[PDB]
Design an enzyme around this catalytic site. Structure first.
Site, PDB file in Angstrom:
ATOM      1  N   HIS A  97       0.879  -1.303   0.077  1.00 33.23           N
ATOM      2  CA  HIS A  97       0.026   0.038  -0.109  1.00 33.23           C
ATOM      3  C   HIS A  97       0.941   1.325   0.023  1.00 33.23           C
ATOM      4  O   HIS A  97       1.680   1.371   0.947  1.00 33.23           O
ATOM      5  CB  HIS A  97      -0.707  -0.008   1.198  1.00 33.23           C
ATOM      6  CG  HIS A  97      -1.999  -1.120   1.155  1.00 33.23           C
ATOM      7  ND1 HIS A  97      -2.174  -1.801   2.258  1.00 33.23           N
ATOM      8  CD2 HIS A  97      -2.632  -1.612   0.344  1.00 33.23           C
ATOM      9  CE1 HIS A  97      -2.976  -2.663   2.075  1.00 33.23           C
ATOM     10  NE2 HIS A  97      -3.300  -2.636   0.824  1.00 33.23           N
ATOM     11  N   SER A  98       0.802   1.923  -1.086  1.00 36.16           N
ATOM     12  CA  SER A  98       1.905   3.089  -1.207  1.00 36.16           C
ATOM     13  C   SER A  98       2.152   4.123  -0.417  1.00 36.16           C
ATOM     14  O   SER A  98       3.314   4.350  -0.262  1.00 36.16           O
ATOM     15  CB  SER A  98       1.876   3.531  -2.873  1.00 36.16           C
ATOM     16  OG  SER A  98       0.535   3.619  -3.119  1.00 36.16           O
ATOM     17  N   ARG A  99       0.973   4.703   0.239  1.00 30.00           N
ATOM     18  CA  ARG A  99       0.841   5.696   1.247  1.00 30.00           C
ATOM     19  C   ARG A  99       1.570   5.357   2.456  1.00 30.00           C
ATOM     20  O   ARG A  99       1.905   6.287   3.355  1.00 30.00           O
ATOM     21  CB  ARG A  99      -0.590   6.178   1.328  1.00 30.00           C
ATOM     22  CG  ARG A  99      -1.525   5.016   1.901  1.00 30.00           C
ATOM     23  CD  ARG A  99      -2.786   5.630   2.212  1.00 30.00           C
ATOM     24  NE  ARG A  99      -3.852   4.796   2.517  1.00 30.00           N
ATOM     25  CZ  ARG A  99      -5.041   5.250   2.707  1.00 30.00           C
ATOM     26  NH1 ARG A  99      -5.468   6.202   2.252  1.00 30.00           N
ATOM     27  NH2 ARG A  99      -5.968   4.021   3.023  1.00 30.00           N
ATOM     28  N   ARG A 141      -3.480   4.334  -2.091  1.00 30.15           N
ATOM     29  CA  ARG A 141      -3.277   3.042  -1.416  1.00 30.15           C
ATOM     30  C   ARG A 141      -2.806   1.997  -2.507  1.00 30.15           C
ATOM     31  O   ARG A 141      -1.978   1.175  -2.368  1.00 30.15           O
ATOM     32  CB  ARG A 141      -4.479   2.671  -0.531  1.00 30.15           C
ATOM     33  CG  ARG A 141      -4.749   1.159  -0.277  1.00 30.15           C
ATOM     34  CD  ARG A 141      -5.974   0.973   0.569  1.00 30.15           C
ATOM     35  NE  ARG A 141      -6.117  -0.344   0.863  1.00 30.15           N
ATOM     36  CZ  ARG A 141      -5.787  -0.725   2.095  1.00 30.15           C
ATOM     37  NH1 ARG A 141      -5.073  -0.439   2.770  1.00 30.15           N
ATOM     38  NH2 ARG A 141      -6.212  -2.011   2.581  1.00 30.15           N
ATOM     39  N   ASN A 175      -3.495  -5.793  -1.737  1.00 33.43           N
ATOM     40  CA  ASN A 175      -3.558  -6.747  -0.334  1.00 33.43           C
ATOM     41  C   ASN A 175      -5.033  -7.453  -0.253  1.00 33.43           C
ATOM     42  O   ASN A 175      -5.329  -7.720   0.991  1.00 33.43           O
ATOM     43  CB  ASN A 175      -2.950  -6.118   0.981  1.00 33.43           C
ATOM     44  CG  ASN A 175      -2.677  -7.269   1.740  1.00 33.43           C
ATOM     45  OD1 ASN A 175      -2.262  -8.373   1.624  1.00 33.43           O
ATOM     46  ND2 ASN A 175      -3.011  -6.900   3.174  1.00 33.43           N
ATOM     47  N   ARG A 176      -5.953  -7.348  -1.170  1.00 37.49           N
ATOM     48  CA  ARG A 176      -7.244  -7.994  -1.335  1.00 37.49           C
ATOM     49  C   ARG A 176      -6.977  -9.004  -2.699  1.00 37.49           C
ATOM     50  O   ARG A 176      -8.084  -9.563  -2.719  1.00 37.49           O
ATOM     51  CB  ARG A 176      -8.332  -7.201  -1.421  1.00 37.49           C
ATOM     52  CG  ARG A 176      -8.535  -6.198  -0.114  1.00 37.49           C
ATOM     53  CD  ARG A 176      -8.713  -6.878   1.249  1.00 37.49           C
ATOM     54  NE  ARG A 176      -9.213  -6.037   2.272  1.00 37.49           N
ATOM     55  CZ  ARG A 176      -7.861  -5.359   2.959  1.00 37.49           C
ATOM     56  NH1 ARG A 176      -6.752  -5.567   2.710  1.00 37.49           N
ATOM     57  NH2 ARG A 176      -8.258  -4.586   3.894  1.00 37.49           N
ATOM     58  N   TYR A 202      -0.906   1.836   9.412  1.00 38.55           N
ATOM     59  CA  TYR A 202      -0.236   1.921  10.720  1.00 38.55           C
ATOM     60  C   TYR A 202      -1.395   1.375  11.586  1.00 38.55           C
ATOM     61  O   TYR A 202      -2.356   0.792  11.387  1.00 38.55           O
ATOM     62  CB  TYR A 202      -0.292   3.326  11.065  1.00 38.55           C
ATOM     63  CG  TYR A 202      -1.417   4.186  11.339  1.00 38.55           C
ATOM     64  CD1 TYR A 202      -2.059   4.701   9.902  1.00 38.55           C
ATOM     65  CD2 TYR A 202      -2.260   3.913  12.357  1.00 38.55           C
ATOM     66  CE1 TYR A 202      -3.255   5.362  10.110  1.00 38.55           C
ATOM     67  CE2 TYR A 202      -3.600   4.971  12.139  1.00 38.55           C
ATOM     68  CZ  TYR A 202      -4.019   5.342  11.135  1.00 38.55           C
ATOM     69  OH  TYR A 202      -5.244   6.148  11.299  1.00 38.55           O
ATOM     70  N   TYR A 243      -9.207  -6.071  11.548  1.00 36.87           N
ATOM     71  CA  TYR A 243     -10.758  -6.227  10.867  1.00 36.87           C
ATOM     72  C   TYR A 243     -10.512  -7.418  10.060  1.00 36.87           C
ATOM     73  O   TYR A 243      -9.325  -7.809   9.528  1.00 36.87           O
ATOM     74  CB  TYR A 243     -10.944  -4.928  10.131  1.00 36.87           C
ATOM     75  CG  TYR A 243      -9.997  -4.423   9.112  1.00 36.87           C
ATOM     76  CD1 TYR A 243      -9.743  -3.020   9.427  1.00 36.87           C
ATOM     77  CD2 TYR A 243      -9.158  -5.005   8.269  1.00 36.87           C
ATOM     78  CE1 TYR A 243      -8.855  -2.257   8.904  1.00 36.87           C
ATOM     79  CE2 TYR A 243      -8.389  -4.349   7.608  1.00 36.87           C
ATOM     80  CZ  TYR A 243      -8.160  -2.844   7.901  1.00 36.87           C
ATOM     81  OH  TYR A 243      -6.990  -2.059   7.030  1.00 36.87           O
ATOM     82  N   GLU A 294       1.798  -4.153  11.456  1.00 37.10           N
ATOM     83  CA  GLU A 294       1.432  -2.715  11.240  1.00 37.10           C
ATOM     84  C   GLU A 294       2.211  -1.880  12.060  1.00 37.10           C
ATOM     85  O   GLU A 294       2.521  -2.027  13.250  1.00 37.10           O
ATOM     86  CB  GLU A 294       0.115  -2.432  11.868  1.00 37.10           C
ATOM     87  CG  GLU A 294      -1.316  -3.203  10.958  1.00 37.10           C
ATOM     88  CD  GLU A 294      -1.317  -2.565   9.516  1.00 37.10           C
ATOM     89  OE1 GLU A 294      -0.915  -1.428   9.348  1.00 37.10           O
ATOM     90  OE2 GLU A 294      -2.132  -3.336   8.742  1.00 37.10           O
TER      91      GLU A 294
HETATM   92 ZN   LIG Z   1      -1.759  -1.601   4.372  1.00 43.26          ZN
END
Ligand SMILES: [Zn+2]
Ligand SMILES: [Zn+2]
Lengths: 58, 301, 299, 60, 62, 46
Positions: free
Chosen positions: B67-69, B125, B140-141, B194, B244, B266
């Site tokens: 996830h790039s951000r 993201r 990541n899905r 995070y 989650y 994370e």
């Molecule tokens: Zn992520």
């Protein structure tokens, strides 16, 4: 872990116990936490274990 | 030089790619750069391989920046790469690991997204595929593990868009093909931010993994080791119970392949700065996370 | 003081020379006050930071009351320089120093500090005497003196001494602060645990200013954390570390100095007292942010 | 205590409710035990036929 | 019921959280005392203690 | 003969029964460190 000392009164002897994870049974007298008796200072015997030495009354 | 490199600032894709080349040039018997594929927009996807010999030794996979951000992850990857070369032959635990295992470090798993966070949208993201009103897939899905199930969106406009089918994203397919072709990965670590969490499978299901007790024990230790440095608190547990539901995620995939030591970090923080974590916290984050990552690697060896 | 190495632990002579250098360079801002002599005859120095006035509302900061807590003396050295770097540049700190004086005691326990360099790096107490040497200078204040959380045993680390203010290192500060009579904040700097504490240590009784000091602590900790992410907890001494009777901030608070806080700096026990020199600047920097926050709320 | 995770396009919001459940406007809401972040964050009850306490995180 | 104690020793303080026991005289000057964060975090492992069990953790004087 | 703990300052390391750590570094009696860059020894006399 640590050793706890007890002093017991019975009509015929005074017993010192050092116990780990245990305490003297009711059958071993009026036993209460107390410093090790000066004459008590080897065989661990038995929820844990107690070593014990006694001196008689007369 | 990687010695005069600034690890206490955020870098662009080119800078990170140049760093990889510097570090390889400086440690050619320890590190090599592998191109495992090309991103949707045609950027090379690079993995650093850390090895002291053997042929396809038991390996540890570490992916970052899927996830790039999550800029703290790539910045941590850069730091990790340098750290590997600094500690090998100095730290006995890490020397032992590398004397029997290889480490594969993918610093920028989503290079198009990363370029996009620097050029257009810092808080992007997804990948940048248009398979175009609503660009990109959540990498990541996209994994073949509970793909499509709760915790992923069938909507292109949402941040957890799973894509048309599992592995549609070359960025994911590249890792899948690499890890499967390799066949000997023993640990598989995905690094995100995070929350300050250490996660094991599953995200897609409330079913407990057969290795729950062990992975929970490893997570407990790694978190203790991480925390021991600066006092940073982490929580740990299965993905589904601790953040989650998330379906089609990497460590669910890795775990179902038989890669037992499958974990997701994370990193910092818990929301004050979030994705915009200050550059001054790069080094402390990387240093403490290293202790946790090392702990897992020791348990692997 | 520009060529001075702030990323390294110093001896007492180095720190004392440093203070003379800083006074030489900044004569209109900083003066070196001698508030007493230690048990072993070492001068006890306080740095006064002032832009004039007479008896201006003041902030007291003390470091190294417990000698082995080296991060604290090192942080105090960095603070001193920082004050001179930031006055007339940082608007907030400039506003503070235009309205208030700052009194900084870098080495509150010089005999112990000398001892930590020569004989015992992990010495805590003063060096007063007794085979068993020294008094816990943070159990020697006249605030629940002798109560639980101090020892009546000379051989123990929290020995309170024969009576309150028995230690000249403590009496020197008491005399000075009481004579001055216009201190608004009193900050004592310790290590380690990563804590910002308010009174009381000697009693479970809450201070009347609990709500406010708790809010001030919260802001300070958030400010400190923003730099390196250094995680602090906060609360009263007795609920957050342990019972500690005869402590400095319990004393100050009972003198009517409302903003009385004790910092426990880095780390959480990995290096403990033996915090490496590499963490001196990072610690000093983040701690400054917490301290400046308290100063801003004091003004 | 009745709890939910509500999955939105940009975030996940946790709901712990009494005498209510998350409204349709809260997105795709699944009955779900509370995660630690949700307990840390969801501290203030708000009117909502009953009341809920709620807290959100972006996808991380 | 879980009871907690701070035991003040010459060189350190040790927290005890106890079930069916209390700190032994060998633990120093022990006061009933609410558990502090450092204690809560460090005193994790129950060990058999006297006729019950305690979890304990210590810090030096800081 | 009871246990005596020390703290020695590359790394930080001692619990001894009838002996003390030799100049093992700059050593002083100190409570056992909580964990028992820059590593950490858990050593034991005699
Ligand atoms: Zn992520
Ligand atoms: Zn102290």
């Amino acid at each position: 872990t640590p050793d706890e000392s007890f002093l017991c009164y019975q009509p015929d002897q005074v017993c010192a116990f050092i116990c780990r994870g245990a305490a003297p049974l009711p059958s071993e007298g009026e036993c209460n936490p107390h410093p090790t008796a000066p004459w008590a200072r080897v065989e661990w015997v038995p929820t844990g274990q107690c070593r014990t030495t006694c001196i008689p009354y007369v | 030089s990687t010695n005069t490199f600034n690890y206490a600032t955020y870098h662009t894709l080119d800078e990170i790619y140049d760093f990889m080349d510097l570090l390889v040039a400086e440690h050619p018997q320890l590190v090599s750069k592998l191109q495992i594929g090309r991103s949707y927009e045609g950027r090379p996807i690079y993995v650093l391989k850390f090895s002291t010999g053997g042929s396809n030794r038991p390996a540890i996979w570490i992916d970052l920046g899927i996830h790039s951000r999550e800029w703290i992850t790539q910045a941590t990857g850069v730091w990790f790469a340098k750290k590997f070369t600094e500690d090998y032959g100095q730290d006995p635990s890490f020397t032992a690991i590398l004397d029997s295992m290889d480490i594969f470090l993918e610093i920028v798993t989503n290079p198009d997204g990363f370029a996009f966070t620097h050029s257009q949208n810092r808080l992007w993201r997804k990948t940048r595929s248009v398979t175009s009103l609503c660009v990109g897939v959540d990498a990541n899905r996209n994994w073949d593990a509970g793909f499509g199930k709760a915790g992923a969106s069938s909507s292109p406009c949402s941040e957890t868009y799973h894509g048309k089918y599992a592995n549609s994203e070359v960025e994911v397919k590249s890792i899948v093909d690499f890890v499967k072709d390799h066949g000997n990965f023993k640990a598989f670590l995905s690094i995100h931010s995070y929350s300050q969490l250490l996660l094991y499978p599953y995200g897609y299901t409330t079913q407990s993994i057969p290795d729950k007790t062990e992975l929970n024990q490893v997570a407990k230790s790694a978190v203790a080791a991480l925390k021991s440095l600066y006092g940073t608190s982490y929580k740990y547990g299965s993905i589904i119970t601790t953040i989650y539901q998330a379906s089609g995620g990497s460590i669910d995939w890795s775990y179902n392949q038989g890669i037992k030591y499958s974990f997701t970090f994370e990193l910092r923080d818990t929301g004050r700065y979030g994705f915009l974590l200050p550059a001054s916290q790069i080094i402390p984050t990387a240093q403490e996370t290293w202790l946790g990552v090392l702990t897992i690697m020791e348990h692997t060896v």
